[PDB]
């Protein structure tokens, strides 16, 4: 429609977005959470099987042949390194990068709000996220639903026990579960108020600690509202050995799927060996939250220049 | 060990305070904060810059596309000005493919802002006010490029180019900004960059840089708004690159088309926040004020 040179977001939306950013900063300042800035580029990347990071070449030091750098998909690894270093509760409003096509709710570069809370367990963190959503969105308090309960209610099936065959009614169980969640659960939740889905299957623990009450589940949660996935958080895994092992598992799964394997970030593992204080952390997509807050129809409407015009 | 941050936690705590202080400074003046892309389908032709390059999968149907990391958010901020954003600033992460150094990191934080209807002196006064506040340093001194040469090297630059830059670097920089920041303005028209060339003296451009304690802190211009002249300079840039065996870069058509529509008269300036924080905290290297310098990232 508009000529390419124009921003995809209206001037009024840019002003309203700036107000929301300041509101988010006040929210954390009032709770004593320190703001930090970590790298957008790294010598390492993530093994998470669902992400495709951007790659770029750096001239490197002195007389080097040069070196590959990956753009950061989320500031998590560096923030955990800071936690081990004693930074205390911290948040960050950074630009994050993912090599994936632009969509109504996706841009290859987007703003992430990610923060960590030492001594907070998963529920405690969820309540804080709930507070932030109610404030900037002026929406009602959230509903919380366990992954298992979500499946039973909308698909009349138990994801923690259901048979592979039953699920089909793909030999990889999690892909099957994610398929069912994407088309069978997601479209039905967060309609009247934000929905927190917690206690994902152990296999989808990512960097979250496994539940002490039920080994089949991980202390991970995701927030959905008005059809948009808004956040993803964990009671963080502090065991370096298990973390190293999960990254190895990631690469095995990548390989078996014909996906490139990624180097394991040794800086994250060495930090975890030194010791990360027990904590829970969460990452929320700021553009999506702003889009909902401003009544926008697409992410592009709240981003100065979506990639198609950048 | 390698896992540790390059900046101390206390420095990170003080850096956040300075960032908040910078935001208050602009809020108090009614300057809007904006966030533009870190990646673009175009890049800069500026002969001295080496941008990072990355590949984007793009639309599922396409063959993908090349993207360039932004060396400064100038082009997008200028497009916003044409769209009517008014006075704006940005605290973004900027990228330049250059070796890590005592005063350089391939990714650093830029404080860049634009002031509609401000001539370059009015804008310099504002930069001066910011330095005073953040560094608690004396008000700055201002020297024209000509005056700076005529007194530190007894020679008239406007009547006497890579040479000048070699002279400025060794014959001027070393003795300016010692007791207070030093603004050097009216650089040779030859080094106008995206600045208007002065109509009172065609031998100079309306551009300035500010130095303090031996550190180059900022670079600003009374902005060139003529689309045709800007396009000509970019082509000039690429011919020089070709002459120097450097790659020729695609010119940002969106910037030119926006300038065709009309950008309000304005002045803009880009400042290195990491260098500013380094001075504020009395840190020795940029690495000491950045959570993880590239060697550790
Ligand atoms: N340690 C606890 C936090 C871990 C966060 C984890 N590393 C992570 O990235 N989770 S995420 O779900 O993949 O991303 C968080 C949010 O980022 C937002 N996101 C992700 N990709 C995009 C894109 N491409 N555009 C816009 N927004 C996006 C979205 O709201 C997600 O809920
Ligand atoms: N429209 C008016 C402003 C134009 C600014 C122009 N695009 C520009 O980039 N000027 S600059 O001098 O190249 O950059 C401004 C500041 O960025 C800082 N800078 C530049 N490169 C680096 C690096 N590599 N590390 C840290 N800081 C850096 C430094 O303080 C410079 O004074």
TrEMBL record, chain A:
It comes from the Bacteria. InterPro entries: Aa-tRNA-synt_II, aa-tRNA-synth_II, aa-tRNA-synth_II/BPL/LPL, EpmA, Lys-tRNA-synth_II_C. Homodimer. ATP binds at residues 98-100, 107, 229-230, 285. Gene3D superfamilies: Bira Bifunctional Protein, Domain 2. Substrate binds at residues 74-76, 116, 236. The keyword Nucleotide-binding applies. This is Elongation factor P--(R)-beta-lysine ligase. It holds the Pfam family tRNA-synt_2.
